[PDB]
Design a binder for this molecule. Sequence first.
Ligand SMILES: CCCC[C@@H]1CCCN1C(=O)[C@H]1CCC[C@@H](c2cccc(-n3ncc(C(=O)O)c3C3CC3)c2)C1
Ligand SMILES: [Cl-]
Length: 288
Amino acid sequence: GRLIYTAGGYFRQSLSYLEAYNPSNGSWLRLADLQVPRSGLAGCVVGGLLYAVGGRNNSPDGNTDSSALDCYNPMTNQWSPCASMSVPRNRIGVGVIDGHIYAVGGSHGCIHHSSVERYEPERDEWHLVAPMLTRRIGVGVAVLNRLLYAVGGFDGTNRLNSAECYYPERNEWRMITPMNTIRSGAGVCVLHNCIYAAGGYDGQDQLNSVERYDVETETWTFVAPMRHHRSALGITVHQGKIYVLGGYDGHTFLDSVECYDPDSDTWSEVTRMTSGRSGVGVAVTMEP
Ligand SMILES: CCCC[C@@H]1CCCN1C(=O)[C@H]1CCC[C@@H](c2cccc(-n3ncc(C(=O)O)c3C3CC3)c2)C1
Ligand SMILES: [Cl-]
C-alpha cells in the first residue's frame, strides 16, 4: 500500500509535522517530525525515499529561508540531512527526472530566483543547471515524458500565467502556451498526458479553478473547479487520482483534502487533515 505524505506547512508559524494518509482505509498516521519547521517547501520521492526540499521557517523569533534537503526513510521512520542547495529557496517547486531532483525557483528574502539546480542522490551533490527564462516563486513544477515544467508563480512584481519547459539534453528552457489564468502558489501535477494547475492566487483572489495542458495539443483547458478556493495547496497523484491538501481560502487555513476523478470530471472531499495548514510538501511512497 502507498500513502500520501504531507510534510511541514503553516498555521500561526511554520510546522514540523509529518503525517501519512492511507486512501485504502481513511487513516492518518503521525510520523517523525522534521528536524526544522518549514513551510513553502516541496516534497518528492526517489528510490522509495521521501525528500523535503527548501521552504522557510516562519517562527515567532526569526524567519529563516531554507536551502535544506532532508531525506525520510519509511523503513526506519527517520529523517537524515542531505547536501544543502546552493541557495535558500522558499516557495519552491521540485520535479524528479531519471532519479534526480530539480529544485526550481523560490525566494531568498527579496531575491526571486530564476535559478535551477539538480540533486544526484548517489553522489549527495547539487549542481546548477540552466536558469529559467523567468524568475518564479510559488512556482508549480511537473514532469511529463522526462521533461520539466515550471508553471505560473510570482516574479517579484507580477503573478504569472506564463509557463516554460526544460529540455535536459539541451540544458535549455523554452516558453510554452500560457495558462488561461494567472496562478501563483497553485498546485501543479501530471496525470496521463496533461499538466494540471489547480488553485493558486491571481493577484486579487484565491482560485478554485483548474486547468490542464495537453502536451500534444499545446493548449490549456479548464476542467471542473475544486470545492474550495485555495492558495499554497499541496498536490499529488495516487493511483490515477489527483489529491489536493490544505491551503488558504482567504479566511481559513484549510484541513480539506479533495480528490479529482478525471473520468467523471468531479471533485469530492475525501478526508480532513488533522489540522488546517497551508504551504505543505506532499508526495507518495510505501507505508513505513
Ligand atoms: C508567513 C506568511 C503569512 C501567512 C500567509 C498569509 C495568510 C495566508 N498565508 C499562507 O498561507 C502562507 C503560509 C506560508 C507559506 C506560504 C506560501 C507557500 C507557497 C507559495 C506561496 N506563494 N508564492 C507566491 C505567492 C503569491 O502571493 O504570488 C504565494 C502565496 C499565494 C500563496 C506562499 C503561504
Ligand atoms: Cl512564506
